[PDB]
Design a protein around this ligand. Structure first.
Ligand SMILES: C=CCN1C(=O)N(CC=C)[C@H](Cc2ccccc2)[C@H](O)[C@@H](O)[C@H]1Cc1ccccc1
Lengths: 99, 99
């Protein structure tokens, strides 16, 4: 859909069987979701924001349905306040920005 | 234009007669800018982010030109790694997210 930006662009995602809201974020290179339980193995990596660097777990090959469109990619879960869908998935869902 | 999200959506702003490069960021509610010289009539504020809080100077009624659309709004200057155009301005250049 076209989303305007008078409101936060939130979408439901279904991930790991769980349903969440998540912010569509063209500013973020990566997708980071708050702690939740995901299956599979995983690695520790850390990422920056404003404010500073949080430690996180890299999960690869993980399947998300984002607004129902589907996709697989790396998710980082860790201490965010908001679950963020960043350009690695926004690209598979085919998102664009138009001005 | 239409920005595809393979690469970061960087754009040039002219702000206070200085030329910067910034990120069009749909997940940020405000515009925050690295430290720079502004005509200093401003207030303390603190914005939150990933990985912590940072402390910013709030200026409003700043004219910004973000591509040749001028937009006027509140700008938070402060210790961010990257200049970020958030939704308060994007709505003013009319930007949309689409998929
Ligand atoms: C990867 C996420 C870090 N990040 C943030 O820290 N902020 C903060 C910007 C205001 C919000 C995400 C956010 C929104 C609301 C609450 C918490 C986080 C932006 O929307 C994100 O793109 C991004 C901007 C950024 C890019 C590169 C280096 C530093 C920062």
């Amino acid at each position: 859909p076209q989303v305007t930006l008078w409101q936060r662009p939130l979408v439901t995602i279904k991930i790991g069987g769980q349903l969440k809201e998540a912010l569509l974020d063209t500013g973020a290179d990566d997708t980071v979701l708050e702690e939740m339980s995901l299956p599979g193995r995983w690695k520790p990596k850390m990422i920056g924001g404003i404010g500073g660097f949080i430690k996180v777990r890299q999960y690869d090959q993980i399947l998300i349905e984002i607004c129902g469109h589907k996709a697989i990619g790396t998710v980082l879960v860790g201490p965010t306040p908001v679950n963020i869908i960043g350009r690695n998935l926004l690209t598979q869902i085919g998102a664009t920005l138009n001005f």
